[PDB]
Design a protein around this ligand. Structure first.
Ligand SMILES: CC(=O)N[C@@H]1[C@@H](O)[C@H](O)[C@@H](CO[C@@H]2O[C@@H](C)[C@@H](O)[C@@H](O)[C@@H]2O)O[C@@H]1O
Ligand SMILES: CC(=O)N[C@@H]1[C@@H](O)[C@H](O)[C@@H](CO[C@@H]2O[C@@H](C)[C@@H](O)[C@@H](O)[C@@H]2O)O[C@@H]1O
Ligand SMILES: C[C@@H]1O[C@@H](O)[C@@H](O)[C@H](O)[C@@H]1O
Ligand SMILES: C[C@@H]1O[C@@H](O)[C@@H](O)[C@H](O)[C@@H]1O
Ligand SMILES: C[C@@H]1O[C@@H](O)[C@@H](O)[C@H](O)[C@@H]1O
Ligand SMILES: C[C@@H]1O[C@@H](O)[C@@H](O)[C@H](O)[C@@H]1O
Ligand SMILES: C[C@@H]1O[C@@H](O)[C@@H](O)[C@H](O)[C@@H]1O
Ligand SMILES: C[C@@H]1O[C@@H](O)[C@@H](O)[C@H](O)[C@@H]1O
Ligand SMILES: C[C@@H]1O[C@@H](O)[C@@H](O)[C@H](O)[C@@H]1O
Ligand SMILES: C[C@@H]1O[C@@H](O)[C@@H](O)[C@H](O)[C@@H]1O
Lengths: 309, 309
């Protein structure tokens, strides 16, 4: 056995250096980090890798950028009073961030997504966090905004209860948000300049899929992932138009995730992609995309070993 | 969500009064109790119902009898040093029992079973606890004995790694032990008077099934249960001869347990039977046998609600 909480949410980040970090919850409610550099074995995931804490079964999201102080990471979660909360890696240490002090109440079954653009050693970051206030069918998605200070943003959509949410900045100040609407279709909401509008993407999916989204490049390339636990992973790809969604699967390892589990995706470069899932073990696994090979299940991420094992 | 640890072991007891108790592990490693009287709703299962603690994913077993001091319960488990341990309900309170002081080392992946006969308001109890020392294929089952003081008993069998173990006293000082041998057959070891011998029962089963056994009456009646997580429950029945094993299932709720989960059974009277399993939720469920109706899935057993839900 491991210390990975069954039906923990997952969050993941990646940057060119390739450095990856993945966040998950342990049996004690702590948020742990595992790390990978290049194709070296994963490190971390132990009781010595706690970065924060949240209510048990808290949703999670994470973003990263490089700053003059080093690598910045923000991990979003919910506390035991269902208040939207944030842990900060400030380039050298983990601390509690300012978002928790705002008093944003989140629906108990809400998921979280986050995106960032612009942050660098010569420009400030722009963060957007997406959440729901209500658990019921037809609830909207709400946005909280950091472009110097936290303030409320938009609300949009009418969703399945506790919908998955994918969020990606496809270009500077250009946002795409993916969620599952009340007809069980994945839908898309878009910001290009001065307004939100309904996007052209849609796809039928199992009720209650976990959703993730990434993007890169100039077209830009967008990939939207969804998975119901113990069903195969799906990907929709945009390269100027949307393709027909396809399964990412391994005939020798059918539907490798456990029921009622979540996914997370990261990307960096042009292009490295990880899509994390939770399997028997309880284990943290991932799909990996490699140029010239395709998709495969990669190395297992360590998530601790309880005493007596 | 609940506070039921996913892939927790389960132990259950029942006595005529019908009182049931079921034991499971929570996310913090505590052993909790839920209670039922007659067909009234289940009670307990909360953080206020802790009876002991054990290593995370500890095996569990339990027995009960009535004494001059009240209802006696013994719950067997393993501590973080893999030492066989015991919690005592002494008729009025929960305390730590004497077995832990003996120093019986248990294999990390061992299951536990226990039986009792003879204990009453006019006779002392006789307890037997079954465990393994080694995790490997071909390991034996070992017995610890209470008939006034703890001492070692028999060792027998050659098992699948971490085999399920069922144990029942089919009559005064008459014992039947069920386990899965290295050929994946469920086998039977028997004590009637002065020696252990190989029983006539055998049945093919999926590798690694969770096993439970109960018995009652004068024939006697024996029932042996086995289940692999996310497969249907099986029962073999003895009423003078063994039947062909059959599935206990509900066409509207196929294979209702989660992968890699465990079962436990209780019985009392002539005859009431519960077979507990772990399902999505994470929930503690049970099959129930009712004279004139047959088998059905009964009321859900409460297993706590984490803060923020
Ligand atoms: C007056 C004020 O609020 N100043 C803030 C500083 O105290 C703070 O250190 C910085 C950075 O905040 C951290 O990073 C940003 C991007 C958010 O993630 C925030 O929640 C987090 O605390 O911001 C102001 O300068
Ligand atoms: C001298 C000695 O060990 N005496 C024992 C008592 O201290 C003890 O209270 C009783 C009962 O023990 C409890 O119940 C038995 C059936 C076992 O479950 C045991 O492990 C548990 O502590 O036993 C002796 O009289
Ligand atoms: C960017 C930083 O990289 C390593 O120093 C980790 O130990 C930190 O937790 C953080 O992820
Ligand atoms: C990029 C945009 O930034 C602010 O204008 C928000 O109010 C919008 O909703 C959007 O996030
Ligand atoms: C980048 C593209 O932007 C808009 O055209 C959307 O309608 C598309 O679905 C896609 O997100
Ligand atoms: C980066 C890759 O882009 C296209 O080749 C897709 O068909 C793959 O699934 C992957 O997203
Ligand atoms: C036999 C006893 O019954 C009730 O008093 C429960 O509260 C105890 O924990 C025990 O099961
Ligand atoms: C009923 C019998 O009791 C003792 O003799 C033990 O040594 C045996 O193994 C068996 O449990
Ligand atoms: C009660 C019966 O006892 C012996 O005959 C065993 O061989 C049987 O399988 C059964 O346990
Ligand atoms: C008590 C009952 O006995 C027989 O009727 C079996 O066929 C049932 O499955 C049940 O064990």
């Amino acid at each position: 056995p491991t210390e990975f909480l069954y039906t923990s949410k997952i969050a993941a980040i990646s940057w060119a250096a390739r450095q990856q970090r993945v966040y998950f919850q342990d049996l004690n409610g702590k948020i742990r980090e595992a790390q990978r550099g290049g194709d070296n074995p994963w490190t971390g995931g132990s009781s010595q890798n706690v970065i924060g804490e949240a209510k048990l079964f808290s949703p999670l999201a994470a973003v990263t950028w490089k700053s003059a102080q080093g690598i910045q990471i923000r991990v979003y979660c919910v506390n035991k009073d269902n208040i939207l909360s944030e842990f900060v890696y400030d380039g050298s240490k983990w601390i509690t961030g300012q978002l928790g002090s705002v008093g944003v109440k989140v629906g108990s079954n809400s998921k979280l997504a986050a995106l960032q653009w612009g942050g660098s050693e010569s420009a400030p970051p722009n963060i957007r966090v997406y959440y729901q206030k209500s658990n019921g069918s037809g609830s909207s998605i709400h946005e909280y905004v950091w472009s110097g200070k936290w303030t409320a943003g938009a609300s949009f959509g009418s969703t399945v209860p506790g919908t998955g949410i994918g969020a990606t900045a496809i270009g500077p100040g250009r946002l795409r948000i993916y969620y599952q609407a009340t007809d069980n279709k994945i839908r898309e909401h878009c910001w290009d300049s001065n307004s939100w509008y309904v996007g052209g993407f849609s796809a039928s999916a199992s009720a209650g899929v976990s959703i993730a989204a990434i993007s890169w490049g100039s077209t830009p390339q967008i990939r939207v992932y969804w998975q119901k636990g113990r069903e195969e992973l799906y990907e929709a790809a945009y390269g100027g138009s949307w393709n027909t969604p396809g399964q990412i699967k391994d005939a020798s390892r059918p539907t490798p995730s456990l029921p009622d589990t979540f996914i997370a995706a990261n990307s960096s470069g042009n292009i490295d992609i990880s899509v994390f899932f939770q399997a028997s073990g309880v284990s943290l696994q991932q799909w990996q995309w490699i140029s010239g090979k395709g998709w495969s299940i990669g190395a297992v991420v360590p998530t601790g070993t309880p005493a007596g094992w």
